[PDB]
Amino acid sequence: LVPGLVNLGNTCFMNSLLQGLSACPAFIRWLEEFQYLSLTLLHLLKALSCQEVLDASCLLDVLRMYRWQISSFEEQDAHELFHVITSSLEDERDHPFGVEFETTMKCEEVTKGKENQDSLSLSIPAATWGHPLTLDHCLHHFISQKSSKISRLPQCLCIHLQRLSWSSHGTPLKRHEHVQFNEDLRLPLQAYRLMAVVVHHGDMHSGHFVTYRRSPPTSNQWLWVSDDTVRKASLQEVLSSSAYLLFYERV
Amino acid sequence: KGLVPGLVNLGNTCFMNSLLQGLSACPAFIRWLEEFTSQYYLSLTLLHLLKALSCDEVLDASCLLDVLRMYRWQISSFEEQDAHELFHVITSSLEDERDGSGSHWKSQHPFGVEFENQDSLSLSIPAAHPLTLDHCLHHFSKISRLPQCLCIHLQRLSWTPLKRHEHVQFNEDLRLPLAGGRGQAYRLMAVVVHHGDMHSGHFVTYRRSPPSARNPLSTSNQWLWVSDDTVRKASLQEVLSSSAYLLFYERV
Ligand SMILES: CC(C)(CO)NS(=O)(=O)c1ccc(NC(=O)[C@H](Cc2ccccc2)NC(=O)c2ccc(F)cc2)cc1
Ligand SMILES: CC(C)(CO)NS(=O)(=O)c1ccc(NC(=O)[C@H](Cc2ccccc2)NC(=O)c2ccc(F)cc2)cc1
């Protein structure tokens, strides 16, 4: 068992994401290699690792004291919080999640630039009849896509599936469809092993966020965390879930 | 920690505080002003304001209006014109300070672009199919030589006046082509954004944080939302999604 975290009104995504991040030991190690946000984040993550209930108001307070208006983030996609944490951890340095793309632009002449991202955000493609939605199809659809190729892969990989779509009328909707994912995922040139899965439940304006993650030691027994409620979980329960964020580590 | 000081609103100076926060996010402009003021005036007071803004203090931009009064400008006329015109009234008067100088008369400011030598690249917004900055650049007597500090003015005012609301894509890196090595690459330093109807004075600047004293001359990754006295952080996605009015870029 791992400690749970309490909900401060709406906190569910933050504690789901903290539970996911604690299941990334290289990210933990890099924080160890590093009041400032990195140390609070390490304290939160090391407490959620290493096998009562906890409180992560310290994270909200260090963010606010850095003049971040967190109450405007419940109106955005949950994933933008993750991008804020990684972008603020890079401010303390100047990266375990960093993926790096080499892009070429042309229209006579060409120009090769470099771009960096904290995760891989994949559009959920339309399901054709007779073939289920797989994460390899989304990854291939994101790779196919001014060109862009992956030229540096991260040690810890975050994969965000854009479950929040927007109609042509401008009104938003949640894609409920299930994407098949395996715990062993080979990125086409490296190989990665699944560590945690953040899932969303209910309508889009509900904040019901839940994390499946591995037990701390790499271990083999999965855990379901919804705030204070922590229990044992099977792998088929993890793989049958409707994934929103996937946290992998390089094998 | 990593914040900038805010500014006050005297009547309606909200665009002016927006422009000052945008202009102090260009380090090459501040270096040019530090060199031009070694003569010894708009350049001296403007550099004082910009050097203060790029560092919970709040400063008084009132002094800028005063030197705008001492250089024989009407000021109060600017409420009946487009906001960007005040920028021209800055740059033109700086060029007027270039002439009549026996010390630094060949020291041109970093915003000048050759076509004619102009102060900023004004682009008219077409209609459509999302709008992107490259569509506006393609719709643009072409550019001849590119400035060190680049200002892009998007024509949100069309004509009886009309406010254009449509969002246009812009990127943190922007490359512009010319014949040979003349074309150049720029990085986004600040975004001035308009809100509300065309006569609302609501202007907001998204600007990068000042460089740290542990890594000087290294550009920060953090962005700030600035509305007069109110300064807060802002994510990158918030900056890239805003209906931009002015785009301040620096040559990389
Ligand atoms: C509360 C606080 C901001 C601190 O006060 N922190 S938080 O708990 O981490 C935190 C809590 C909630 C959110 N947002 C949401 O749930 C949005 C809310 C939302 C819904 C529609 C349009 C914009 C915003 N929907 C999702 O993301 C979502 C993701 C996948 C889905 F399939 C369906 C929905 C973000 C962060
Ligand atoms: C001297 C003083 C301190 C006081 O004026 N200057 S100031 O504060 O910097 C200063 C403050 C405001 C303005 N202009 C406006 O609001 C015009 C007002 C206006 C509107 C229609 C026709 C003529 C004039 N609208 C804009 O530009 C505008 C830009 C982009 C948009 F999508 C929508 C509107 C100019 C200057």
Numbering used by the authors:
A (entry chain A): 66 to 99, 114 to 130, 136 to 178, 222 to 234, 239 to 276, 294 to 301, 318 to 353, 359 to 361, ...
B (entry chain B): 64 to 103, 115 to 129, 135 to 182, 217 to 228, 246 to 258, 262 to 273, 296 to 301, 318 to 330, ...
Reproduce, without paraphrasing, sentences from the article in which this PDB structure was first reported:
The mitochondrial deubiquitinase ubiquitin-specific protease (USP) 30 negatively regulates PINK1–parkin-driven mitophagy. Consequently, the mitochondrial deubiquitinase (DUB) ubiquitin-specific protease (USP)30 has emerged as a critical negative regulator of mitochondrial quality control due to its ability to remove ubiquitin from a subset of mitochondrial outer membrane proteins. By grafting structural elements of well-crystallizable human USP family members onto the periphery of the human USP30 protein, we generated stabilized and crystallizable protein constructs that retain DUB activity and the propensity to compound inhibition. This process is illustrated with four diverse chimeras: chimera 1 (USP30ch1) features the fingers of USP7, chimera 2 (USP30ch2) features the fingers of USP14, chimera 3 (USP30ch3) features the fingers of USP14 and the box 4–5 insertion of USP35, and chimera 4 (USP30ch4) features the fingers of CYLD.
The structure of USP30ch3 in complex with NK036 was solved to 2.75 Å following crystal optimization through fine screening and additive screening as well as data optimization through multicrystal averaging and anisotropic scaling. The asymmetric unit contained two copies of the protein–ligand complex. The ligand was surrounded only by USP30-encoded side chains as well as secondary structures generated by USP30 residues, with chimeric portions of the sequence spatially separated. While the catalytic residues of USP30 are not contacted by the inhibitor, we observed that the catalytic triad was not aligned in the inhibitor-bound state, as the catalytic histidine was flipped out.
